[PDB]
Amino acid sequence: SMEQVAMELRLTELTRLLRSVLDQLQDKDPARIFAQPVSLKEVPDYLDHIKHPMDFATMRKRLEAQGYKNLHEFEEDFDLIIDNCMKYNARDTVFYRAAVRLRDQGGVVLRQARREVDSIG
């Protein structure tokens, strides 16, 4: 139908906006601490600690499948990256500190994305 096409165009355009959001967020992680899944070879007990792992590569796979229906779902995944790290790692670690800086700096990017999504429908 013409309605299914129009909806598909909306999802395509959301995906395009979320791809730019993801790029901006990932620039706030220049050390690439959150780029890839925590290795279960190198941290074999990770899943005993963290029940829903997340990372930027995994978000990019979901994005390119148009697997984010709205900004809320995308933010949920970004928040898991931060929140998983801040639980698994102690406060006095490079990992925890990197998460705090990503959270703080990403808030700015996400604040305006929420406006662009409400604005452009």
Side-chain angles (χ1 to χ4, degrees), residues 1-2 4-6 8 11-15 17-40 42-60 62-68 70-110 112-119 121:
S1 66
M2 219 12 266
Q4 294 294 331
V5 169
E8 293 160 6
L11 179 67
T12 300
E13 283 307 293
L14 175 64
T15 301
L17 179 153
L18 295 181
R19 192 181 303 112
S20 168
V21 177
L22 182 67
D23 289 350
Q24 282 171 76
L25 291 175
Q26 191 150 28
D27 288 337
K28 309 315 180 152
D29 171 32
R32 293 195 80 78
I33 291 161
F34 307 102
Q36 291 293 329
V38 172
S39 172
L40 307 177
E42 299 166 11
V43 190
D45 77 350
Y46 187 66
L47 298 188
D48 290 346
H49 293 269
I50 294 299
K51 297 293 166 191
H52 297 95
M54 193 45 54
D55 64 275
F56 289 130
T58 300
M59 292 187 64
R60 198 170 292 281
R62 180 168 168 194
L63 182 63
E64 293 310 334
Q66 307 187 344
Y68 292 112
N70 54 57
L71 181 58
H72 178 73
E73 290 184 347
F74 179 96
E75 290 174 296
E76 275 190 335
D77 270 352
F78 180 64
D79 285 346
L80 275 175
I81 294 177
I82 298 312
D83 291 336
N84 287 345
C85 183
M86 293 172 70
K87 290 163 194 81
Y88 187 79
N89 304 102
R91 224 156 26 249
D92 82 326
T93 62
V94 63
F95 307 102
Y96 184 111
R97 295 171 167 284
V100 166
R101 289 163 64 80
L102 178 59
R103 186 197 62 193
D104 284 353
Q105 293 194 272
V108 177
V109 170
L110 292 175
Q112 202 51 48
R114 163 54 59 207
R115 294 190 71 83
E116 289 182 312
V117 158
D118 289 4
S119 187

mmCIF file of all heavy atoms in Angstrom, residues 50-80, unseen atoms left out:
data_model
loop_
_atom_site.group_PDB
_atom_site.id
_atom_site.type_symbol
_atom_site.label_atom_id
_atom_site.label_comp_id
_atom_site.label_asym_id
_atom_site.label_seq_id
_atom_site.Cartn_x
_atom_site.Cartn_y
_atom_site.Cartn_z
ATOM 1 N N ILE A 50 26.494 -9.311 34.077
ATOM 2 C CA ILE A 50 25.768 -8.433 33.222
ATOM 3 C C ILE A 50 24.818 -9.239 32.352
ATOM 4 O O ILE A 50 25.212 -10.085 31.517
ATOM 5 C CB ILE A 50 26.697 -7.569 32.308
ATOM 6 C CG1 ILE A 50 27.507 -6.625 33.160
ATOM 7 C CG2 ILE A 50 25.907 -6.838 31.272
ATOM 8 C CD1 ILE A 50 26.727 -5.601 34.010
ATOM 9 N N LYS A 51 23.516 -9.005 32.575
ATOM 10 C CA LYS A 51 22.504 -9.826 31.892
ATOM 11 C C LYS A 51 22.111 -9.387 30.462
ATOM 12 O O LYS A 51 21.647 -10.206 29.630
ATOM 13 C CB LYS A 51 21.260 -9.946 32.792
ATOM 14 C CG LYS A 51 21.538 -10.653 34.105
ATOM 15 C CD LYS A 51 21.877 -12.117 33.905
ATOM 16 C CE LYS A 51 22.501 -12.824 35.106
ATOM 17 N NZ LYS A 51 23.058 -14.174 34.851
ATOM 18 N N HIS A 52 22.302 -8.094 30.135
ATOM 19 C CA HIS A 52 22.012 -7.610 28.836
ATOM 20 C C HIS A 52 23.235 -6.761 28.347
ATOM 21 O O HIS A 52 23.211 -5.520 28.413
ATOM 22 C CB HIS A 52 20.758 -6.779 28.881
ATOM 23 C CG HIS A 52 19.562 -7.593 29.284
ATOM 24 N ND1 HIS A 52 19.113 -7.665 30.586
ATOM 25 C CD2 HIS A 52 18.823 -8.487 28.577
ATOM 26 C CE1 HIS A 52 18.096 -8.514 30.653
ATOM 27 N NE2 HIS A 52 17.910 -9.029 29.450
ATOM 28 N N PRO A 53 24.244 -7.450 27.823
ATOM 29 C CA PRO A 53 25.421 -6.761 27.274
ATOM 30 C C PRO A 53 25.050 -5.869 26.113
ATOM 31 O O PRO A 53 24.095 -6.171 25.334
ATOM 32 C CB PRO A 53 26.314 -7.884 26.766
ATOM 33 C CG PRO A 53 25.917 -9.065 27.513
ATOM 34 C CD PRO A 53 24.432 -8.924 27.774
ATOM 35 N N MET A 54 25.825 -4.779 25.932
ATOM 36 C CA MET A 54 25.590 -3.920 24.785
ATOM 37 C C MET A 54 26.913 -3.232 24.438
ATOM 38 O O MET A 54 27.765 -3.040 25.323
ATOM 39 C CB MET A 54 24.493 -2.896 25.063
ATOM 40 C CG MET A 54 23.987 -2.161 23.791
ATOM 41 S SD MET A 54 23.626 -3.057 22.292
ATOM 42 C CE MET A 54 22.488 -4.276 22.944
ATOM 43 N N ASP A 55 27.004 -2.805 23.189
ATOM 44 C CA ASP A 55 28.182 -2.083 22.699
ATOM 45 C C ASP A 55 27.840 -1.380 21.365
ATOM 46 O O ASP A 55 26.790 -1.663 20.777
ATOM 47 C CB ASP A 55 29.298 -3.064 22.441
ATOM 48 C CG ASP A 55 28.968 -4.026 21.358
ATOM 49 O OD1 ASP A 55 28.323 -5.047 21.646
ATOM 50 O OD2 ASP A 55 29.278 -3.737 20.157
ATOM 51 N N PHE A 56 28.734 -0.536 20.889
ATOM 52 C CA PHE A 56 28.403 0.243 19.717
ATOM 53 C C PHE A 56 28.313 -0.604 18.463
ATOM 54 O O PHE A 56 27.451 -0.282 17.560
ATOM 55 C CB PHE A 56 29.370 1.415 19.453
ATOM 56 C CG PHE A 56 29.276 2.553 20.405
ATOM 57 C CD1 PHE A 56 30.428 3.081 21.024
ATOM 58 C CD2 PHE A 56 28.102 3.246 20.585
ATOM 59 C CE1 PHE A 56 30.323 4.169 21.828
ATOM 60 C CE2 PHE A 56 28.017 4.367 21.406
ATOM 61 C CZ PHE A 56 29.159 4.832 22.068
ATOM 62 N N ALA A 57 29.116 -1.660 18.294
ATOM 63 C CA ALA A 57 28.982 -2.496 17.096
ATOM 64 C C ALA A 57 27.614 -3.186 17.009
ATOM 65 O O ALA A 57 27.010 -3.339 15.946
ATOM 66 C CB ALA A 57 30.121 -3.524 17.025
ATOM 67 N N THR A 58 27.123 -3.618 18.154
ATOM 68 C CA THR A 58 25.888 -4.352 18.243
ATOM 69 C C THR A 58 24.771 -3.361 17.934
ATOM 70 O O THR A 58 23.841 -3.723 17.235
ATOM 71 C CB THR A 58 25.743 -5.038 19.594
ATOM 72 O OG1 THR A 58 26.851 -5.963 19.762
ATOM 73 C CG2 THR A 58 24.413 -5.772 19.801
ATOM 74 N N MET A 59 24.852 -2.132 18.450
ATOM 75 C CA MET A 59 23.822 -1.094 18.105
ATOM 76 C C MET A 59 23.829 -0.796 16.600
ATOM 77 O O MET A 59 22.756 -0.676 15.994
ATOM 78 C CB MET A 59 24.068 0.212 18.845
ATOM 79 C CG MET A 59 23.843 0.146 20.375
ATOM 80 S SD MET A 59 23.960 1.730 21.188
ATOM 81 C CE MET A 59 22.579 2.616 20.449
ATOM 82 N N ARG A 60 25.018 -0.709 15.983
ATOM 83 C CA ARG A 60 25.111 -0.445 14.569
ATOM 84 C C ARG A 60 24.469 -1.567 13.748
ATOM 85 O O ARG A 60 23.832 -1.291 12.758
ATOM 86 C CB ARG A 60 26.561 -0.207 14.161
ATOM 87 C CG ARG A 60 26.723 0.509 12.795
ATOM 88 C CD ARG A 60 28.195 0.912 12.617
ATOM 89 N NE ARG A 60 28.652 1.958 13.546
ATOM 90 C CZ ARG A 60 28.410 3.271 13.430
ATOM 91 N NH1 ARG A 60 27.631 3.735 12.443
ATOM 92 N NH2 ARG A 60 28.896 4.117 14.344
ATOM 93 N N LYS A 61 24.621 -2.830 14.134
ATOM 94 C CA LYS A 61 23.936 -3.934 13.441
ATOM 95 C C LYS A 61 22.413 -3.773 13.487
ATOM 96 O O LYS A 61 21.737 -3.888 12.467
ATOM 97 C CB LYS A 61 24.329 -5.323 13.994
ATOM 98 N N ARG A 62 21.901 -3.464 14.668
ATOM 99 C CA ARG A 62 20.480 -3.272 14.812
ATOM 100 C C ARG A 62 19.978 -2.073 14.021
ATOM 101 O O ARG A 62 18.935 -2.153 13.376
ATOM 102 C CB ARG A 62 20.093 -3.208 16.220
ATOM 103 C CG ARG A 62 18.644 -3.016 16.427
ATOM 104 C CD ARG A 62 18.267 -3.243 17.862
ATOM 105 N NE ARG A 62 16.871 -2.788 18.139
ATOM 106 C CZ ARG A 62 16.340 -2.610 19.330
ATOM 107 N NH1 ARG A 62 17.024 -2.840 20.448
ATOM 108 N NH2 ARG A 62 15.068 -2.174 19.451
ATOM 109 N N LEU A 63 20.716 -0.997 14.044
ATOM 110 C CA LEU A 63 20.370 0.187 13.269
ATOM 111 C C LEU A 63 20.246 -0.093 11.764
ATOM 112 O O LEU A 63 19.276 0.326 11.112
ATOM 113 C CB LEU A 63 21.468 1.226 13.487
ATOM 114 C CG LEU A 63 21.310 2.565 12.812
ATOM 115 C CD1 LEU A 63 20.076 3.252 13.361
ATOM 116 C CD2 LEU A 63 22.525 3.430 13.049
ATOM 117 N N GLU A 64 21.220 -0.785 11.216
ATOM 118 C CA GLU A 64 21.277 -1.015 9.769
ATOM 119 C C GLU A 64 20.231 -2.027 9.278
ATOM 120 O O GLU A 64 19.868 -2.041 8.101
ATOM 121 C CB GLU A 64 22.698 -1.390 9.354
ATOM 122 C CG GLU A 64 23.728 -0.261 9.507
ATOM 123 C CD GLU A 64 23.328 1.108 8.892
ATOM 124 O OE1 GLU A 64 22.518 1.143 7.943
ATOM 125 O OE2 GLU A 64 23.846 2.173 9.330
ATOM 126 N N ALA A 65 19.725 -2.830 10.186
ATOM 127 C CA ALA A 65 18.560 -3.631 9.983
ATOM 128 C C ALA A 65 17.266 -2.816 10.167
ATOM 129 O O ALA A 65 16.203 -3.414 10.169
ATOM 130 C CB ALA A 65 18.532 -4.797 10.976
ATOM 131 N N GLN A 66 17.351 -1.487 10.362
ATOM 132 C CA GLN A 66 16.184 -0.667 10.775
ATOM 133 C C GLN A 66 15.418 -1.238 11.963
ATOM 134 O O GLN A 66 14.171 -1.264 12.005
ATOM 135 C CB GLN A 66 15.254 -0.375 9.546
ATOM 136 C CG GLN A 66 16.019 0.221 8.395
ATOM 137 C CD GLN A 66 15.117 0.679 7.255
ATOM 138 O OE1 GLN A 66 13.951 0.297 7.188
ATOM 139 N NE2 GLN A 66 15.615 1.567 6.444
ATOM 140 N N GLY A 67 16.178 -1.702 12.959
ATOM 141 C CA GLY A 67 15.662 -2.349 14.077
ATOM 142 C C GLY A 67 15.344 -1.378 15.221
ATOM 143 O O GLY A 67 14.836 -1.806 16.254
ATOM 144 N N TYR A 68 15.599 -0.069 15.045
ATOM 145 C CA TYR A 68 15.123 0.901 16.046
ATOM 146 C C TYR A 68 13.814 1.586 15.532
ATOM 147 O O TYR A 68 13.866 2.339 14.584
ATOM 148 C CB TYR A 68 16.175 1.939 16.412
ATOM 149 C CG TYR A 68 17.373 1.317 17.177
ATOM 150 C CD1 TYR A 68 18.631 1.255 16.593
ATOM 151 C CD2 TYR A 68 17.223 0.818 18.450
ATOM 152 C CE1 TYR A 68 19.741 0.693 17.251
ATOM 153 C CE2 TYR A 68 18.341 0.213 19.145
ATOM 154 C CZ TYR A 68 19.565 0.175 18.508
ATOM 155 O OH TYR A 68 20.678 -0.360 19.165
ATOM 156 N N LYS A 69 12.754 1.395 16.248
ATOM 157 C CA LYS A 69 11.438 2.000 15.834
ATOM 158 C C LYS A 69 11.254 3.444 16.241
ATOM 159 O O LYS A 69 10.488 4.163 15.614
ATOM 160 C CB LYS A 69 10.258 1.187 16.364
ATOM 161 N N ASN A 70 11.954 3.872 17.292
ATOM 162 C CA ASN A 70 11.876 5.214 17.781
ATOM 163 C C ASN A 70 13.210 5.521 18.528
ATOM 164 O O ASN A 70 14.036 4.609 18.725
ATOM 165 C CB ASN A 70 10.655 5.368 18.685
ATOM 166 C CG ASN A 70 10.608 4.340 19.809
ATOM 167 O OD1 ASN A 70 11.552 4.226 20.623
ATOM 168 N ND2 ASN A 70 9.531 3.559 19.857
ATOM 169 N N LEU A 71 13.430 6.779 18.849
ATOM 170 C CA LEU A 71 14.598 7.202 19.641
ATOM 171 C C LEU A 71 14.644 6.565 21.021
ATOM 172 O O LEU A 71 15.772 6.268 21.508
ATOM 173 C CB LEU A 71 14.578 8.700 19.822
ATOM 174 C CG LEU A 71 15.731 9.329 20.591
ATOM 175 C CD1 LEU A 71 17.025 8.980 19.904
ATOM 176 C CD2 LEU A 71 15.582 10.844 20.753
ATOM 177 N N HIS A 72 13.508 6.322 21.667
ATOM 178 C CA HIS A 72 13.502 5.700 23.014
ATOM 179 C C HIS A 72 14.259 4.353 22.993
ATOM 180 O O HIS A 72 15.103 4.074 23.880
ATOM 181 C CB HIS A 72 12.073 5.527 23.607
ATOM 182 C CG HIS A 72 12.028 4.853 24.949
ATOM 183 N ND1 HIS A 72 12.425 5.478 26.103
ATOM 184 C CD2 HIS A 72 11.661 3.601 25.305
ATOM 185 C CE1 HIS A 72 12.294 4.647 27.123
ATOM 186 N NE2 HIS A 72 11.828 3.498 26.668
ATOM 187 N N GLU A 73 13.967 3.523 21.990
ATOM 188 C CA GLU A 73 14.609 2.209 21.912
ATOM 189 C C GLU A 73 16.158 2.327 21.766
ATOM 190 O O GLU A 73 16.881 1.524 22.322
ATOM 191 C CB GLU A 73 14.081 1.385 20.736
ATOM 192 C CG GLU A 73 12.624 0.881 20.896
ATOM 193 C CD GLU A 73 12.118 -0.028 19.754
ATOM 194 O OE1 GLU A 73 12.733 -0.142 18.653
ATOM 195 O OE2 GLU A 73 11.052 -0.661 19.981
ATOM 196 N N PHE A 74 16.598 3.277 20.954
ATOM 197 C CA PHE A 74 17.987 3.567 20.712
ATOM 198 C C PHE A 74 18.657 4.071 21.988
ATOM 199 O O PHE A 74 19.718 3.568 22.395
ATOM 200 C CB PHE A 74 18.117 4.596 19.599
ATOM 201 C CG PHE A 74 19.521 5.022 19.258
ATOM 202 C CD1 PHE A 74 20.250 4.441 18.204
ATOM 203 C CD2 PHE A 74 20.098 6.080 19.961
ATOM 204 C CE1 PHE A 74 21.488 4.915 17.819
ATOM 205 C CE2 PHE A 74 21.356 6.532 19.619
ATOM 206 C CZ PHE A 74 22.056 5.967 18.551
ATOM 207 N N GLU A 75 18.017 4.980 22.671
ATOM 208 C CA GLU A 75 18.539 5.449 23.970
ATOM 209 C C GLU A 75 18.632 4.368 24.989
ATOM 210 O O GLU A 75 19.605 4.378 25.813
ATOM 211 C CB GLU A 75 17.665 6.577 24.519
ATOM 212 C CG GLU A 75 17.794 7.841 23.725
ATOM 213 C CD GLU A 75 16.776 8.886 24.233
ATOM 214 O OE1 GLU A 75 15.516 8.727 24.149
ATOM 215 O OE2 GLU A 75 17.238 9.865 24.734
ATOM 216 N N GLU A 76 17.692 3.422 24.957
ATOM 217 C CA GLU A 76 17.740 2.303 25.903
ATOM 218 C C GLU A 76 19.071 1.537 25.730
ATOM 219 O O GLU A 76 19.742 1.181 26.714
ATOM 220 C CB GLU A 76 16.555 1.345 25.737
ATOM 221 C CG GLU A 76 15.316 1.760 26.496
ATOM 222 C CD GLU A 76 14.242 0.674 26.522
ATOM 223 O OE1 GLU A 76 14.189 -0.219 25.621
ATOM 224 O OE2 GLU A 76 13.454 0.717 27.484
ATOM 225 N N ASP A 77 19.413 1.273 24.488
ATOM 226 C CA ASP A 77 20.651 0.509 24.190
ATOM 227 C C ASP A 77 21.882 1.365 24.614
ATOM 228 O O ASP A 77 22.873 0.857 25.199
ATOM 229 C CB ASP A 77 20.711 0.103 22.738
ATOM 230 C CG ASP A 77 20.053 -1.260 22.502
ATOM 231 O OD1 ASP A 77 19.681 -1.952 23.550
ATOM 232 O OD2 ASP A 77 20.011 -1.655 21.279
ATOM 233 N N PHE A 78 21.860 2.651 24.322
ATOM 234 C CA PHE A 78 23.023 3.481 24.768
ATOM 235 C C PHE A 78 23.178 3.498 26.292
ATOM 236 O O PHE A 78 24.292 3.309 26.837
ATOM 237 C CB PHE A 78 22.807 4.905 24.252
ATOM 238 C CG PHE A 78 23.898 5.862 24.607
ATOM 239 C CD1 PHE A 78 25.193 5.707 24.132
ATOM 240 C CD2 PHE A 78 23.620 6.936 25.446
ATOM 241 C CE1 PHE A 78 26.205 6.602 24.516
ATOM 242 C CE2 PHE A 78 24.611 7.857 25.791
ATOM 243 C CZ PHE A 78 25.885 7.676 25.322
ATOM 244 N N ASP A 79 22.081 3.657 26.987
ATOM 245 C CA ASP A 79 22.083 3.607 28.423
ATOM 246 C C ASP A 79 22.611 2.251 28.924
ATOM 247 O O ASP A 79 23.298 2.284 29.958
ATOM 248 C CB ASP A 79 20.680 3.854 28.979
ATOM 249 C CG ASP A 79 20.275 5.337 28.902
ATOM 250 O OD1 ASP A 79 21.147 6.223 28.672
ATOM 251 O OD2 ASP A 79 19.061 5.584 29.093
ATOM 252 N N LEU A 80 22.357 1.109 28.229
ATOM 253 C CA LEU A 80 22.900 -0.191 28.700
ATOM 254 C C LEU A 80 24.428 -0.187 28.651
ATOM 255 O O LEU A 80 25.101 -0.760 29.508
ATOM 256 C CB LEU A 80 22.442 -1.396 27.845
ATOM 257 C CG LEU A 80 21.129 -2.055 28.125
ATOM 258 C CD1 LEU A 80 20.939 -3.108 27.010
ATOM 259 C CD2 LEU A 80 21.146 -2.635 29.571
#
